[PDB]
Design a protein around this ligand. Sequence first.
Ligand SMILES: C[n+]1ccccc1CC(P(=O)(O)O)P(=O)(O)O
Ligand SMILES: C[n+]1ccccc1CC(P(=O)(O)O)P(=O)(O)O
Ligand SMILES: C=C(C)CCOP(=O)(O)OP(=O)(O)O
Ligand SMILES: C=C(C)CCOP(=O)(O)OP(=O)(O)O
Ligand SMILES: [Mg+2]
Ligand SMILES: [Mg+2]
Ligand SMILES: [Mg+2]
Ligand SMILES: [Mg+2]
Ligand SMILES: [Mg+2]
Ligand SMILES: [Mg+2]
Lengths: 338, 338
Amino acid sequence: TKKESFEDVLPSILNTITTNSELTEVPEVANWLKKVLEYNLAGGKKARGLTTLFAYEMLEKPENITEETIYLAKTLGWCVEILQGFLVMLDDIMDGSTTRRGVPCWYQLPEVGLAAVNDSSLMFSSIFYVLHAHFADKKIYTNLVELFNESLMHTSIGQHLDVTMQKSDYSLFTIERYNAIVKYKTAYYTYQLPVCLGMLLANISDPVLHQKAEDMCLEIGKFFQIQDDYIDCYGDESLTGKMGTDIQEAKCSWLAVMALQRCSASQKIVFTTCYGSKEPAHIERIKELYKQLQLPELYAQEETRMYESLIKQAHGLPSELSPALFVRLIHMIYKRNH
Amino acid sequence: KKESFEDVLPSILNTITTNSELTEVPEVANWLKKVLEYNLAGGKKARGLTTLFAYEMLEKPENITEETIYLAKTLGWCVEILQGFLVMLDDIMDGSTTRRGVPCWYQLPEVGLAAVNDSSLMFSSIFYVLHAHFADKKIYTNLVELFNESLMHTSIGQHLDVTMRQKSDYSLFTIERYNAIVKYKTAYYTYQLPVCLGMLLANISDPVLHQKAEDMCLEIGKFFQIQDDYIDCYGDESLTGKMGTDIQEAKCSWLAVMALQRCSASQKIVFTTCYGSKEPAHIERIKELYKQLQLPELYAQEETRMYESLIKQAHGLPSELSPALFVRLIHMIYKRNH
Ligand SMILES: C[n+]1ccccc1CC(P(=O)(O)O)P(=O)(O)O
Ligand SMILES: C[n+]1ccccc1CC(P(=O)(O)O)P(=O)(O)O
Ligand SMILES: C=C(C)CCOP(=O)(O)OP(=O)(O)O
Ligand SMILES: C=C(C)CCOP(=O)(O)OP(=O)(O)O
Ligand SMILES: [Mg+2]
Ligand SMILES: [Mg+2]
Ligand SMILES: [Mg+2]
Ligand SMILES: [Mg+2]
Ligand SMILES: [Mg+2]
Ligand SMILES: [Mg+2]
């Protein structure tokens, strides 16, 4: 498949990183970074990486594709996956997670701890070395750099809106707020960024076509993140790799937004009493409540209603952008369970 | 002047807002204004100033305009923001309580570990500022690369510093390790970065000049950080703004390296029992020892010997690099007590 052609290049990227920086003079560190990247890139569906590649392939004229440019698309893809490793390494710190992708969270390991913040800084550094190494003499260098940087700003905005903190006043848990959280923290780097890289590599220029792409990208990313929210509560931990914590940490997830939309007055009491606590009596009661408000069934309807809506918006796009591309991206996620 | 450097800060903060997606999320735009104002306030502004001085003294005098000076101040403020990012992450890892006379950001009650996200914000800001003022100049890509290289070098240094002895084994507390730690964790971004920024702004691009600058900059940084280590122990918290933690955190600081050169066989046993403990009497026993071994006296001599040595080198530089500039920079930190 396409996944095995993408995982092939990992050791080569690991090597590019070392050889193209001051890590060569300090191999104690160049070896520590190899262990960090291998652990924090392992497991995982590699979806953002693939998306970048698939996008290049689907968008470039097949006669202009070279083996060189395919390698570059895999490299860009891997930058995005490093980005992802960086973000979830910090995210697990802010969310007091204990596992991810089947194993303990990087910071949980005993030899690491809060030293993880610096491992993240190493990872995020790597990306610009790789970019610099391949791309310094090409006209698109600036655009690539700018894009990875925007994607950090957006992701940081989102993360702030999410982790921003009164006990039992759940009146910021609105749909207006959830839509902003999920635009900035997930949509931009998960879909806008891969596709936009695919577009740059394919030398697509039109600022009107970028906009049309952004609009569709962000719709899909909201979709994606509503599924993630569902999975936190209802996913199977062996399949998903992670223990679900949105309830205990009192996050504004889609499920809580929807619970509040549906609650009677007494149920709202139950919710503002038991949501956000780590006691397991309290977490069971909140899942019993999600069960009565019939949210697993709403989810199913909404997954399908958005699915149809996206497919329809995808078929509305100019062909220079490839409807097929978006259709497939949507199918990759539709009905997923991890 | 410093107060003429501080006069430009409101137009920077302003450029960070208007120039990004923050124009759409005024909640987050404001939060970032608080993060920047709190974490840029207090402190010597020295790396910012070094940027300005380096430009003004490497440039040919009649090219210096009301505009290029604003540009040099803009670049200084980018370095100051970088400083803010690094101290904010260092303070988490080092377990500090206060910086610049006030609580460390992560210590503030509402922030906690979500400080890692604010650091990402601050880091992303740097590049909106660069884009706004340099997008359409030939030095843009270099400016961007400098910043990203500076993150790498610093993180490498931070890695060698946070990587934890294995009980009472101080066999790694050597000067070879100390040298490696300080060259990477401090010298690159404290002196090598600002001076290089001034060089870029004054079209100096001979890479034998960039090399000679760099060899002098790393020596000055080594020195600067030795003073830092002395201050952790012996500085006045009201002059300095921060509490000392090197002893408690069992840091490879210049003082421990030197104490291990001087310990007798029984004193090495006192030092190994008590170094690296939060117990107030253990911390006192190590300072009692630092006094027995006469380290304050050692410092004073060494500070001066190293000072002489740096001055010899500054005078050995070629005219286009301005020995005056380096001489100036040295005199600005020689005998500093915060
Ligand atoms: C969705 N997301 C976006 C940016 C960074 C990290 C994540 C992780 C997810 P996850 O922890 O469920 O994998 P979130 O904690 O729900 O937000
Ligand atoms: C020296 N240094 C370099 C990079 C970032 C932060 C610092 C902070 C100092 P400081 O915490 O004493 O101000 P260090 O922890 O002793 O190394
Ligand atoms: C944005 C989110 C939900 C973070 C995890 O994304 P994935 O669930 O794609 O994580 P991996 O497949 O890369 O583990
Ligand atoms: C590299 C170190 C020692 C970090 C603190 O640097 P300064 O001593 O320059 O602190 P501020 O002037 O920015 O407060
Ligand atoms: Mg989260
Ligand atoms: Mg999480
Ligand atoms: Mg989640
Ligand atoms: Mg430190
Ligand atoms: Mg410190
Ligand atoms: Mg110190």
